[PDB]
Amino acid sequence: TLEDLEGENQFTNLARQHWLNVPQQAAKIKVKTDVLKRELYLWPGYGEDSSNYHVLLIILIVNAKRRERVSTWDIFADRPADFSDLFRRALSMTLDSSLSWTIRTHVLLFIIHAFQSLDYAIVRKECAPLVSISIWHNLSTEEKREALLDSNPHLRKAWRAATKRFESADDATKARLRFDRAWLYSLVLDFLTLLYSGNAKQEHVLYCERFVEFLTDLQSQLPTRRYVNTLLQDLHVLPALSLSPIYNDEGNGLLRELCNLFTHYTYFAVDDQSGVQLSREQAYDRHCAILAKLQRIAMKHFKEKLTVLALSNYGSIDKRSELEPLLQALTDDELVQLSNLMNIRTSYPDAARIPVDRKFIVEVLLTTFERRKTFQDAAQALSVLPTEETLFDISLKRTDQYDGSRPLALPKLNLQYLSVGDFLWRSFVLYRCESFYAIRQDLEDALIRLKPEVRRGGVTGFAGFSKMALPISKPVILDVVKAEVTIDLRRLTPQIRRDWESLRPDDVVFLLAVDASRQKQSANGGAVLSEAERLGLVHVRAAEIIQVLDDKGKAIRDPQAYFDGHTRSDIRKIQLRLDATSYKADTEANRNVYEDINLIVRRSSRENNFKPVLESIQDLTLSEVPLASWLHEVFLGYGDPAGATFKQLPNRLKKINFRDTFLDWQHLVESFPGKIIEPSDDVSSSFGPPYVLESVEKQVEEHPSKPSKKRRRDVEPALMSKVETLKVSTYKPPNNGPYPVDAPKLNKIRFTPTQIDAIYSGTQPGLTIIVGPPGTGKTDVAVQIISNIYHNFPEQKTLLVAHSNQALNQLFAKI
Amino acid sequence: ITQHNRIWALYRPFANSAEGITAVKIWRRYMQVHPEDAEDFIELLIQCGLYTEAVKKYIEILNNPKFQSKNAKGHYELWSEMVDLLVEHAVDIETGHETGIDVERIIRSGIERFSDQRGKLWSGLATYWIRRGNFDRARDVFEEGITTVMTVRDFTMIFDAYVEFEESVIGTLMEAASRRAEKGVVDESADFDLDIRMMRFEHLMDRRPFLLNDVLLRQNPNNVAEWEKRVALWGDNKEEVVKTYTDAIAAINPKKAVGAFHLLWANYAKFYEKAGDLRT
Amino acid sequence: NVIMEEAAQITEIENFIPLALQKPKNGQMALQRVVLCGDHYQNSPVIQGLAFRHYANLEQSLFSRLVRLGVPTINLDQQGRARPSISNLYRWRY
Amino acid sequence: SESSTKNAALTAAQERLARFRALQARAKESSQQNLKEATKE
User: Any idea where the RNA helicase aquarius beta-barrel domain is (chain A) (predicted)?
Assistant: First the structure.
């Protein structure tokens, strides 16, 4: 932590012995070595003559600030050249093999943190050459690069511009460009060498996990992914990681999950260059085209031996097991020739010492031809209702004990996303993980409070008392699935009985079967039990309670009368619909999960809305068009960020009736500083409310001046602000009747010019953001914008979304 | 309600003489009192073109086991009519997660309930998949129907339907290839697809005897004659013959054998002796 | 038209759900105006999972992401609810 | 050479037609065997 660095650390002692060796007779003042003071002293003292220890300390301080969600990029904004020199030194130290693996992992984590801070101008400028097209110069074959350049003319133009910039540069600039282009290739080669080095320790596994997380983060941002995906496909990082001994270890479950996440992100159905999200049909067509090209190459080269492989169908060759014998039929030389015919890399540098055998080539060919499920298919395959295995997942347990020391194989929200569907799938996955963690915590708390134990005869009983769960009998299926569960409220309090009897329709409940005797297997010196086996829980099934019935099976028409009246029987019947997927899985596996169920656990109504939110997220992910076309570029973080504003949209309203937005003419004049206001009529006198503002663009008179080409170099382009004429029109308001109640309500709040501009932006079509502090009258501006939208567009509907009910009540009171 | 019966008797001809959405709403409002004629309203759904409404009415009729058809129509006949209407109007029927309907689950339920007409349901599902433009899904459905048919008549009907669909696809591909070759345009992808279809048809024709042997073994695992026929159809493949012999040994019950398991054991011993494996 | 109040306290998924509450017509959405009022310097949404809030950045809001992306936003510079001393103490971050 | 190429193409077309006829005969025989097995079952 940051407070641990304030002590007498080894790095602080080394810095004091190396950098604080001044002979000045300083006073003996007991000043605490704060982290902020040390960072401020290191920032001004940084220079080109500083050693690598200062750069390592600065990188560690930046990582500690990023782990605490503190800004650190602003402190480097004062010195851009020093920041660039520090970044170059960190890049040089990352490729240096003399240092330990911990320093390399720290440098990789710092680079991954810097890659997630592309909003800063200096960080984006530093990371621009690292993910540029020059990495395409590190391809295995020139034919593949030529085909990629001929596929899109924009890529060829960018490559030509990069080549011209490299040729026109000096020697030091060309060396820096070559180092920036080859840094990613050197890092990939070092990762591949460390994966196949053997006898990997925990530091090597942590470095591999950090590299996988960095690759996933690079593939998550489209401007970097457009080269990162091509580099990973040319280098065959996934086939090398699949056959690596580090990922094959049983203890490296997090590394395997990170590799799976990186493979899912790299094989996403989205265009690398254009950035348009690809559907399932486009991905299927691309896979069919790749399979047809492979079959044509096999027929042209090895038709005598690979006739079955060339004549195989798309579904008969996409499977790894089906294509295993076809690839095993060809020899090593035949496999090498087939890989060279498809522009696939089959050899590596001798310095990396990457083992390239027939098994590695077969795995690469199987992974390249494997059909991969799309993001929509992965979102549809994910169950909304949590299960016993999903709640007790290894990834959830790893994320529960996360402290920032190691990466996690979960999606991360950033400033830019590959596609709207990918962002929706990531949000759905995060919401499902949070709901599963909350459900697992609630189930663990209920099992701890219930204190299950083994009674006489082997029947599992509950010794403790818990209000979050109740023991029940085995449920009986009524229709198919709708079932009836019998509960007893004789030992429950009146408040608990009232809470249990007031279950709303489709309420999320859990049917739990628990056997504590398996916990005795943990006491016999056997294998290590899981978290669910430690508490005795065996199975948990989600269900939706629809209705609550009495002991006679009749629905309670009056709940208040039943609660106030004397109940004859304390036994209640609850109608529960179990999930169809879990029931079908139990029926297919012939498992009697419902026969052993003996506990029913309820949840709070505020925290039982996760299933509908997950269903809505899955429906949005499966939807083809979940976002507007005008706001797609702004939401994706690509292109011009101001393109969604009203000043750039073609549907901007020229004339807008503000009605009673301005109290008088002076308020309207003061609300538009720097803009010329002219009355619509010929009367020079000021007019009161209501007022309508029409924005007229001032047409520049193109005078017939001579085309002088001499005075054109020193004439810089002046930022001439277009003075749009805000013509004010005054009209008599329509009377609504002679009664005093018929008089329309007028606003009595004098809005500021910033509030007036915000209201004008909100009234106009497009995207508007109002950054308002507390007490700035943002609710009043929102109410004024809603009133203006209702008055100007009676046929349009306005949907207000409030974070809290108090804000909605305040908005309703203002309206 | 007693007078509402006479009112509906005086309004049925009025609704029939009006037609359209108003008559559809009148029939929907009249189904809450006399649902026994609601199947006739399904005929109105035939007249109005609402295939989804007809499917929903059929599902609601099949959900209630106490419903009695006025026209003395059985539940199997109603299910077959609904399947035929779904196959004929697969394009006009909207399917999605918003409506909360599944055609595969209904097809599986119909196959499980009607075991004597499971091949007809599989053929209807294959025809619906072919009409939906999904050739791979139709091929997978045909393979699943061939691999899960207990009766050989249903398996033969499903195989004939799949062979007819494959022959139609191969003829269309050959016509497209001939049209491309006559125009001087060489399409390697179309020729590769035609060759792959021909190879798949040849593989299906070769594995049809294997599928018949598997169906015979599923009908009677203790039948040594089917195992002997499968071993004869294996030919010179020693590994396939050994696997078939092991499956026959592990599948045929010695206490319920209808054939001669000792004859199969003697044949295996003679094959081992002819291979020179006296110890085996 | 969609107007969101206190968008910085709502997650990105919760903000995108209200913007897609209606089915598209003829392949296009009927939404025209999207206004979001909030304060990026205020508290973010509450996340129970520490790994989701920190590593996965689930606590980040759509308004904060739009402000960090460089999109133009209108900043209110007038307050009339608290005293001048409290307003000046709260104006250091703004 | 474009003289014997026509004869080679004609021979290849005749071989392809013979292979297609053999495949059709095999399919018809398989259908007949499937019908006989269905009747037997």
Answer: 452-603
